[PDB]
Amino acid sequence: ADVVVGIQWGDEGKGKIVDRIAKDYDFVVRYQGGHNAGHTIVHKGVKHSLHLMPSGVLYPKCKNIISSAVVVSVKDLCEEISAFEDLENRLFVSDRAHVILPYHAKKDAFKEKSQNIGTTKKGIGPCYEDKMARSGIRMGDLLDDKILEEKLNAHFKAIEPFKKAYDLGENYEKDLMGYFKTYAPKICPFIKDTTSMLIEANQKGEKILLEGAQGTLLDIDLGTYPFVTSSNTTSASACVSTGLNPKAINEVIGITKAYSTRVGNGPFPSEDTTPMGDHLRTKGAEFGTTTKRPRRCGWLDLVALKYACALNGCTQLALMKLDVLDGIDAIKVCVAYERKGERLEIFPSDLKDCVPIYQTFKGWEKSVGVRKLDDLEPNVREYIRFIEKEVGVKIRLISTSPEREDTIFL
Amino acid sequence: ADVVVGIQWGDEGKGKIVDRIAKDYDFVVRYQGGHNAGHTIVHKGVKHSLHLMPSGVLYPKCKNIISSAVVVSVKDLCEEISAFEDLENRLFVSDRAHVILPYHAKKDAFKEKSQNIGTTKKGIGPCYEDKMARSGIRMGDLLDDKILEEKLNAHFKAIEPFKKAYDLGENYEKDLMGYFKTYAPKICPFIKDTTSMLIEANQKGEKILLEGAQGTLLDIDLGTYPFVTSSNTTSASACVSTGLNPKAINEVIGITKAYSTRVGNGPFPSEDTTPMGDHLRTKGAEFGTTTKRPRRCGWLDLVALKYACALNGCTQLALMKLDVLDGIDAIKVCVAYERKGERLEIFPSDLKDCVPIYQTFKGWEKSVGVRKLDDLEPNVREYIRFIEKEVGVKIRLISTSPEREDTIFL
Numbered sequence A, B: 001a002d003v004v005v006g007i008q009w010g011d012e013g014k015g016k017i018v019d020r021i022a023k024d025y026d027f028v029v030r031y032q033g034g035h036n037a038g039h040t041i042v043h044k045g046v047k048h049s050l051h052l053m054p055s056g057v058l059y060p061k062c063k064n065i066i067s068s069a070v071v072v073s074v075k076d077l078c079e080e081i082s083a084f085e086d087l088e089n090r091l092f093v094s095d096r097a098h099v100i101l102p103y104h105a106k107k108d109a110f111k112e113k114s115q116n117i118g119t120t121k122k123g124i125g126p127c128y129e130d131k132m133a134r135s136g137i138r139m140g141d142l143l144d145d146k147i148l149e150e151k152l153n154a155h156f157k158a159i160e161p162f163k164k165a166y167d168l169g170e171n172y173e174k175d176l177m178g179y180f181k182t183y184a185p186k187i188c189p190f191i192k193d194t195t196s197m198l199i200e201a202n203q204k205g206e207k208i209l210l211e212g213a214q215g216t217l218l219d220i221d222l223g224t225y226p227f228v229t230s231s232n233t234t235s236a237s238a239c240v241s242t243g244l245n246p247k248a249i250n251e252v253i254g255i256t257k258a259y260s261t262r263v264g265n266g267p268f269p270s271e272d273t274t275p276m277g278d279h280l281r282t283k284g285a286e287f288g289t290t291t292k293r294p295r296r297c298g299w300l301d302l303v304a305l306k307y308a309c310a311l312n313g314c315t316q317l318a319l320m321k322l323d324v325l326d327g328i329d330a331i332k333v334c335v336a337y338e339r340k341g342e343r344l345e346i347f348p349s350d351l352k353d354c355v356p357i358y359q360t361f362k363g364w365e366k367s368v369g370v371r372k373l374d375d376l377e378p379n380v381r382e383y384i385r386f387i388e389k390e391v392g393v394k395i396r397l398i399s400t401s402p403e404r405e406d407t408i409f410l
C-alpha cells in the first residue's frame, strides 16, 4: 500500500496528487478526519470540491474507501454522493466509522469561545470525543432501526444537561430522528466492512493508495498541540485503522507546498507578516476556493519538514503550487531556528521563542503550467535541488498549477 | 524497531515476554494506554507488578520510554518509580503524554452507570476524551508553573457544571493544586522530548522494543466496540505516536494465551461457561495477581487470532500460559463461526449470533516449567503445530510458567 500524506499543516495539495496517480490503484482510501478537509481537483477547467469523498472518484474503475477512523457527517456525504454517477460498487463507507451529530458542531462552536483553537467548527473534535467516550454512534448502527433508535435515545438522555449551554433547539430530538429518517436510506447501501475488504486486497496484492487529510503538523499526538486536529494524520495512522499493518506500507509521498500556510491559530515559526510575505498572501492565502478562511502565509520550514519526513518515513516528496511563487522577487527558506542564542537543527516539542533562520533564493517568473523538467527556469530547479538535499528525500513530483496534468514526474 | 503486541483482549503475557527479551534492546517503549495495564514480571520467586512502568525496568542498561500516546496518572507513576533504584537516565516520560486528573476517574465511574462497559474505572477514557477536546493537560505543562496554573484554572472553570454530577469534592480545586505541588517536583526530572529521542535512535540503528498494552481486540477503532479501550493497541499505533514511521517496524511478536480471557463486558464467541471451562476458571480466571477482577474464560479463537495477526502484521507468535492447561482433560479451539447456518472463516464487524465451531484436542499433564522443546509432551507440540498451521504464523516463543526463564525459543 502507498500513502499520500501532507507534511505541513494541511492544504499542501494532497487531493491533486491522489487524483493524478489514482489511475494506477485499485483502492483509494480516506483514512481519517472528516469534512473539515476541503480541497479541489481540477481537470480541463472543471473544478471538483471534495470534502470526505476520496480523490479517486474521477476514475470509475477505482474503489473509493472511507475507512474506520473517519468521522462522517452523513448529510454532507450524501450531498457529495449526489454529484457523481453510479457510485454504488465504487464507494464504500466503513461500518466502524463514527457519525457526526449536529450537537457536535454546536459543542465545537461553544468550546471555541474559550479555547480559540480556530477549528473548522464542523464538530470533528467532539465526534472523536464521543468515540473515546465509547458513546459515539457508528455507521453500522444505521443498518438496524432498533439499534439506531436505542443509541439515539441514549444520546438524547446524555445530552439533556447541555441543551441550554450548546443552544440546542427545542426540537433537537424530533429533528435528529427525522434527519436519520431522511439520510439513513440514502447512505446505507454504501456501508460495508471495509476492514475485511482491505485485509483481503492486501493479501491478494491489489494496489492500495491511502489518502491523508489535514497534515503532519496537525497530528493530535505529535503536531503543534493544542492547535491540531483530533485525529492522527501520519502514514502510520493509515495502517492503524484501515486493517493494513505497518509492514504493508511501501511508498510514502510527502506533499509539501513550496511555501507554508496554516489556517487557524497556533505557532508558525516561518510565518512572514512583512512585505516579503505579501506576494504569498495575494496568490496563496485564498487556497483556490472550497476553503473559506484565508490562510496565514510563510516560508518553507525545513526543520519542520525533516521532522514530518521522519514521522512518516517519506520515500518521495511532491513539491506543490510552484506557480504561486511566479513573479516573486525572492524566496526564503527557514533552515534552522534560533532560540535565545542557540541554533536548533531539530524540531522541538515547544516552539516558544523559536525564531526562523533564513536562506534566501532567487525567485522565478513563469513556472505555471510547465510540464517538463527541461522547460523550468534554472531558479526553479535550484530551489528543488536545495530542498531535496537538505531534507534527504528526493522530490519526485512537481506541480505547476491546480490542473491534474500540470505535473512533472522525475 | 520490534513490537510486542497482545493479539487477544489483553492479559496475554506481554510483560513477561518484554522482560524476557528486553536485554537485547537499547529502548523499551510503552506507547499507549495507562495504568489500566497491570501485569507481573516474575524472576527467581520475586514478582514485580507493573502498571505504566515499561517492562525493561529490570535491565538497568535499558532506557525505558513512556511515549506520547500514553495517559499518565502522575501519582501512580511516582509510586512505581519509588520501587526501583537510580531510574534517572533510564526512564523518560514524553512531554506530550496526557495527564489523568482525578475528575477523569470520577467521570469514568459516572458514565459506567449507564454504559456498563466494564472499564478499569481509572479515568483512561475521559483522559483521552480531553485529549480529543484539546483541553487536556500534557506532561510538558508540569515543567512551567505558570503554564500549569493557567491550564488548571481553565480546567476548574470548565469542570464547574459537573461537580455535583461527578461527585467532585468541595475542595477539588485546592486538592488538585496540592496534588501537583506534591508530585510535579517528583516527576519533572523524567519529562523529555521522547519523540526526538526515538527518531534519533532509529536513525542511528539502535535497538528499539515497543511494548503494547491491552490487546488488539480492545482497539478503539477495530476491536469489539464499545467494549474496547480508548486507545489504538496494534503495531501501527506503536509508530503513530512514538516518532517512528511504519517502515521502521521489523519483528512483530503477537502474544496469545493458549486459551482466551476477557475482563469486563462485551462479546466473546469462544467463552465457555460449561463445566468444560471450569478448569480454565480455577487456574486462569485469577490472572496471577495485580489484576483484581476475575476474567471471563474461554477457548483459543482462531477466527479472531487471524484477524489480529492481519491487523498487526505478526511475524512470530508467543504462546503463553501453557501450564494453566496442565491436567485439563480436553482443549477446544474455535476454528470458525456459525451464524444462522452460515460458516464464517473471517472475523466480522458484528459478532451477533456468531456461535463458535470447535475442534477438540487432547490435553496434557505437565508442561509447567519445561524449558526445552524436547521435554514437552507430544500433546503440547501437536497443539502448537495446529495453531501455527491454521494461523500461518510460526510460534517462536512458548511460556510454561510466569517465571522469566520458563520460556522456550524456537
Ligand SMILES: O=c1[nH]cnc2c1ncn2[C@@H]1O[C@H](COP(=O)(O)O)[C@@H](O)[C@H]1O
Pocket (backbone or CB within 6 Å): A009, A010, A011, A036, A037, A038, A117, A118, A119, A120, A121, A122, A123, A124, A125, A213, A214, A218, A227, A228, A229, A230, A263, A264, A265
Ligand atoms: O483540511 C484542512 N486544511 C487546513 N487546516 C485544517 C484542515 N482541517 C482541519 N484543519 C485545522 O486543524 C485545526 C483543528 O480543526 P478541526 O479539524 O476542525 O478540529 C484547525 O487549525 C483547523 O483549521
Ligand SMILES: O=c1[nH]cnc2c1ncn2[C@@H]1O[C@H](COP(=O)(O)O)[C@@H](O)[C@H]1O
Pocket (backbone or CB within 6 Å): B009, B010, B011, B036, B037, B038, B117, B118, B119, B120, B121, B122, B123, B124, B125, B213, B214, B218, B227, B228, B229, B230, B263, B264, B265
Ligand atoms: O490491561 C488490561 N487487561 C485486560 N483488559 C483491559 C486492560 N486494560 C483495559 N482493559 C479492558 O478494556 C476495556 C476498557 O477499560 P479502560 O481501558 O479502563 O477504559 C474494559 O473491558 C477493560 O477491562
